[PDB]
Amino acid sequence: MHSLLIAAILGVVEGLTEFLPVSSTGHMIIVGHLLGFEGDTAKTFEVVIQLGSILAVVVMFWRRLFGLIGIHFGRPLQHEGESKGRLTLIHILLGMIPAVVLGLLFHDTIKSLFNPINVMYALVVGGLLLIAAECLKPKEPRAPGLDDMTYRQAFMIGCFQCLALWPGFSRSGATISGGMLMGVSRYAASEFSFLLAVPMMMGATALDLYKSWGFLTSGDIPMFAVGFITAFVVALIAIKTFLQLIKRISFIPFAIYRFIVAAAVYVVFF
Ligand SMILES: CCCCCCCC/C=C\CCCCCCCC(=O)OC[C@H](O)CO
Ligand SMILES: CCCCCCCC/C=C\CCCCCCCC(=O)OC[C@H](O)CO
Ligand SMILES: CCCCCCCC/C=C\CCCCCCCC(=O)OC[C@H](O)CO
Ligand SMILES: CCCCCCCC/C=C\CCCCCCCC(=O)OC[C@H](O)CO
Ligand SMILES: CCCCCCCC/C=C\CCCCCCCC(=O)OC[C@H](O)CO
Ligand SMILES: CCCCCCCC/C=C\CCCCCCCC(=O)OC[C@H](O)CO
């Protein structure tokens, strides 16, 4: 079926690009345009399949996330770091505060000024930031592992997450870049970005799904579902492959890829 095929394709796109630093939103406006799936219900279907990508992070970091909110299951938590420190909820809170504050003050201002030309610029500037992070990061990470991160790095990553309010910038791209610039290794900054994404995207999805509840009907449920679980499965593959890959390559190829996507935005919309 046309509808379910679209849901699977967009689910694959969402699951691949939500946690790679390449702007799921940038890919979604392109693919949704090439499939004819563009209206108000499409912009809420894409909010719903973002819950699928979240769930993949929740599943992969299950024991870590529950431990952060004070629920520890049996075996002690796997320690990832060179120090005796442990990532805490304060790290997560500090990483949330800046984008939460700026998001609440400017979310409506950003949404009403949406445009594919802005996503194109965000794809380029975000790619340039990734390049700058790779070029300017210290030779020796200050936080090689997730549990080595400081309140200060977490808060600075939180400040960089405000760049994600710019559509097309890639929440993951902004936070990993800011993390790398603060001396967090690629791997640990990627993990922290994914953990941070759980409260950020769950709050953002609940907010946009509430404001857009009027569009939905009973007939969208079968399509909204197939995209959810496609995004979930693909994100599960993507996160696991990305974390294995980012130990061996840099973000230079992702930054260059974003330049290609930005050109694709221009040729598809202009
Ligand atoms: C949904 C639209 C498509 C999804 C968008 C995908 C974005 C991928 C872009 C750039 C990644 C390039 C780097 C990843 C490719 C590396 C392949 C590889 O094999 O690198 C291993 C190397 O040998 C080291 O060990
Ligand atoms: C498509 C529209 C996109 C619009 C936005 C694009 C604007 C580009 C801005 C800056 C790029 C050039 C950056 C300048 C590079 C400086 C390099 C440097 O300073 O070198 C120091 C060196 O590392 C000492 O060791
Ligand atoms: C070769 C095939 C085509 C390749 C694409 C065309 C090349 C120019 C395109 C985009 C600008 C890339 C900007 C590169 C910025 C520096 C890259 C780099 O060497 O990173 C430094 C390193 O990580 C620390 O020393
Ligand atoms: C907030 C929005 C984001 C805006 C993003 C603008 C993009 C700037 C473009 C290129 C900068 C690249 C600078 C590269 C300078 C290289 C310096 C260097 O060589 O490294 C020094 C030292 O080794 C390090 O620890
Ligand atoms: C870490 C992972 C790095 C590896 C990188 C992942 C490689 C994924 C490659 C292709 C998937 C994209 C397939 C889905 C997009 C194609 C469908 C599409 O674009 O729809 C256009 C439509 O058909 C026109 O009418
Ligand atoms: C229509 C849309 C098409 C979009 C097209 C994309 C535009 C790419 C822009 C700038 C890339 C060049 C800026 C890279 C400059 C960084 C080089 C640098 O900073 O040097 C590395 C450092 O010295 C290491 O030691």
Question: What are the sequence ranges of the domains in the chain?
Answer: 1-270
**Of 117, 126, 112, 201, which is closest to residue 169 (Cα–Cα)?**
126
* 184 Cα to the center of ligand 6, angstroms: 23
Strand partners, 184: 143
Give the span between the Cα atoms of 197 and 86, in whole angstroms: 19
Give the span between the Cα atoms of 263 and 176, in whole angstroms: 23
- For residue 148, give both structure tokens: 């080595």
Give the span between the Cα atoms of 165 and 173, in whole angstroms: 12
CB of 256 sitting under 6 A from ligand 1: no
Ligand 2 pocket, mutate which of 125, 135, 169 (most atoms under 8 A from CB): 125
Write the CB contacts of 84 (distance below 8 Å, at least 6 apart in sequence). Answer: none
Q: Given the CA of residue 138, which atom of ligand 4 is nearest to it? A: 25
* 132 Cα to the center of ligand 4, angstroms: 4
Residue 162: C-alpha distances to residues 77, 150, 214 (Å): 30, 19, 28
The experimental technique behind this entry is: X-ray
Residue 168: C-alpha distances to residues 66, 67, 77, 123, 182 (Å): 30, 32, 35, 6, 23
Beta carbons within 10 angstroms of residue 104's beta carbon: 10
Contact 47, 14 (CB under 8 A): no
Q: One-letter amino acid identity for 225? A: A
Q: Environment class of residue 92 by beta-carbon count within 10 Å: exposed (0-12), middle (13-18) or buried (19+)?
A: buried
Write the CB contacts of 221 (distance below 8 Å, at least 6 apart in sequence). Answer: none
Contact 110, 157 (CB under 8 A): no
Q: Within its chain, how far is the Cα of 126 from the centroid?
A: 13
Give residue numbers after which the chain breaks (C–N above 2.5 Å).
none
Ligand 5 pocket, mutate which of 34, 247, 249 (most atoms under 8 A from CB): 34
Residue 199: C-alpha distances to residues 147, 162, 181, 226 (Å): 19, 15, 23, 23
Q: Which ligand minimizes its atom distance to the CA of 15? A: 1
CB of 246 sitting under 6 A from ligand 6: no
Give the span between the Cα atoms of 220 and 222, in whole angstroms: 6
Beta carbons within 10 angstroms of residue 98's beta carbon: 17
Q: Where are the beta strands (DSSP E) in the chain?
A: none
Torsion angle of C-alpha atoms 3, 41, 54, 188, degrees rounded to 10: 110
CB of 138 sitting under 6 A from ligand 4: yes
Place of tokens 């690009």: 17
Rounded to the nearest 5 percent, the helix, strand and coil shares of the chain are 75, 0, 25
Place of tokens 């500090």: 94
- For residue 123, give both structure tokens: 């794809």
Ligand 1 pocket, mutate which of 249, 251, 259, 261 (most atoms under 8 A from CB): 249
Give the span between the Cα atoms of 228 and 46, in whole angstroms: 9
Residue 30: C-alpha distances to residues 10, 119, 160, 231 (Å): 10, 10, 25, 17
